[PDB]
């Protein structure tokens, strides 16, 4: 009956949201902890939808732990689960994106995050390309050689967590603003 979603926004905030039409027009409570030997604390930051509780926000303070939680119809637990929080990591969108051109090459840099094992990916294309081409690195300094100064290229960047460290169920960041470039100068459309 209870459908649940978890997001760990940029290693700052955990958001757990739930849906259950049975317990609609009713405020279910959310209780959590970060260890299996401590008492549960109650949610101090509730999200609502259609006037009733639909989620919880926890400030996790960059901590890498197993979140243990339960949703209750008062005292009666309706849903119980436990998960490593970083499995639902969504890194923040690339900030301060800069491009430096040299003849038929470009180096795209941006502000690196405070946590490691991430992939900073740059996607690009010209009007002659049918799909986006991609290059990625461990830091936000990706160099793409062999392009054409004479062509217009659309570009955008994002941050992904590495599957070997964070597992397969993470979310890529949102892509940064799209930028268009011909002959080492910025443009409007492409």
């Amino acid at each position: 009956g209870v459908q649940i979603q978890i997001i760990y926004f940029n290693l700052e905030t955990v958001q757990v949201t739930w849906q259950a039409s049975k317990y609609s027009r009713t405020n279910l409570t959310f209780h959590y902890r970060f260890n299996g030997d401590e008492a549960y604390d109650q949610c101090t930051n509730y999200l609502l939808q259609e006037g009733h509780t639909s989620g919880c926000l926890l400030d996790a303070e960059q901590r890498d732990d197993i979140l243990y939680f339960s949703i209750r119809n008062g005292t009666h637990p309706v849903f119980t689960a436990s998960r490593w929080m970083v499995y639902y990591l969504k890194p923040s969108s690339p900030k301060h994106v800069r491009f430096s051109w040299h003849q038929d090459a470009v180096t795209v840099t941006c502000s690196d995050l405070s946590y490691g094992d991430l992939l900073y990916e740059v996607q690009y294309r010209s009007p002659f390309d049918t799909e986006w081409q991609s290059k990625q690195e461990n830091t936000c300094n990706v160099t793409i050689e062999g392009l054409d100064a004479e062509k217009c290229y659309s570009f955008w960047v994002r941050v992904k967590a590495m599957e070997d460290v964070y597992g397969p169920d993470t979310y890529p960041s949102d892509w940064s603003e799209v930028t268009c470039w011909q002959r080492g100068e910025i443009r409007d459309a492409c």
């Binding site: 038929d104 010209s126 002659f128 081409q133 991609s134 290059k135 062999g146 054409d148 062509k151």
Partner: protein, 196 residues
């Protein structure tokens, strides 16, 4: 010295791997010599190589891929020379294939693409590719380009016009596997347009 070299291929045939060794001196007497691998194996101490023409070959799922093994050249029971090697550091990838080049009329470039079986493997799934091209007439004026993808683009204005060009590609392991360059893919030939 009775020195030799080796290379491994992980998941070459299904989930089984291969270990291939050959002597550095080609003119040696092989009638009396046999190779033996000992250590970092699954539920066995040693395994024997098959003497096939001028090479020694193994093919099995019993490679542990943790720690070093001991590859020894044997003349009966006595070991003439011994080499301690980790099979994850002598990996030789399977060579790329379906290499092809297409001229794009409007773009004025050549889209080079190729394929590799390593994309469908579990272990050695990350490689660095080396695309080499030249004018078929020249000698050692080869131009090398390293890339992680299977698609590359050459500009028409950065190549000689009305010229036959040759292009081939090879791969080496990357990301927690070390080793050697694969064999080159078959070459692909293309003529560039004239100055018109």
């Amino acid at each position: 010295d009775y020195s030799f070299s080796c290379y491994s291929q992980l998941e070459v045939n299904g989930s089984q791997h291969s270990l291939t060794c050959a002597f550095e001196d080609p003119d040696v007497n092989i009638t009396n010599l046999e190779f033996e691998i000992c250590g970092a194996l699954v539920e066995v101490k040693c395994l024997n190589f098959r003497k096939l023409q001028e090479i020694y070959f193994i093919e099995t799922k019993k490679f542990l891929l943790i720690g070093k093994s001991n590859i020894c050249v044997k003349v009966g029971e006595k070991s003439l020379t011994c080499k301690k090697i980790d099979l994850t550091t002598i990996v030789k990838p399977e060579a790329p294939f379906d290499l092809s080049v297409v001229y794009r009329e409007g773009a004025n470039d050549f889209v080079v693409t190729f394929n590799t079986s390593h994309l469908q493997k579990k272990y050695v799934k990350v490689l660095m590719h080396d695309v080499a091209y030249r004018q078929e007439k020249d000698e050692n004026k080869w131009t090398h380009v390293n890339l992680s993808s299977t698609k590359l683009t050459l500009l028409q204005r950065k190549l000689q016009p009305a010229a036959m060009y040759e292009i081939k590609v090879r791969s080496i392991p990357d990301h927690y596997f070390k080793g050697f360059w694969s064999e080159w893919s078959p070459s692909y030939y293309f003529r560039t347009p004239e100055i018109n």
